[PDB]
């Protein structure tokens, strides 16, 4: 069983400023935004004779 | 008459933080901190004969 959710669309997103005098190191070039969240399931009988 | 005043020995500094990858160019060396006050007076009379 495979189980994959997706990321809402009806979120705001915002962003704080960090005084440092190397923004570029500090903050990066992308944020996370959303996780892709999901499950799994894997099972195997055996029942023998 | 020449006045000069001095400066308060009874008061607050403060550092307030700003935003400048380049902190020296915008802070600079030294702040402003109190204004050395004065004055002056010079009169001249002349009456003639």
Known sequence: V???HQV???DKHSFN???TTT???TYGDRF???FIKG???YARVS???
Do not use: N, W
Request: proline share 5%.
């Open 8 to 10: 809402s669309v009806l």
């Open 39 to 41: 499950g799994h399931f």
């Open 32 to 34: 996370i935004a959303d």
């Open 23 to 25: 923004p570029h190191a």
């Open 17 to 19: 400023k960090i005084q």
């Open 2 to 4: 495979l189980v994959q």
């Open 47 to 49: 029942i023998t004779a």
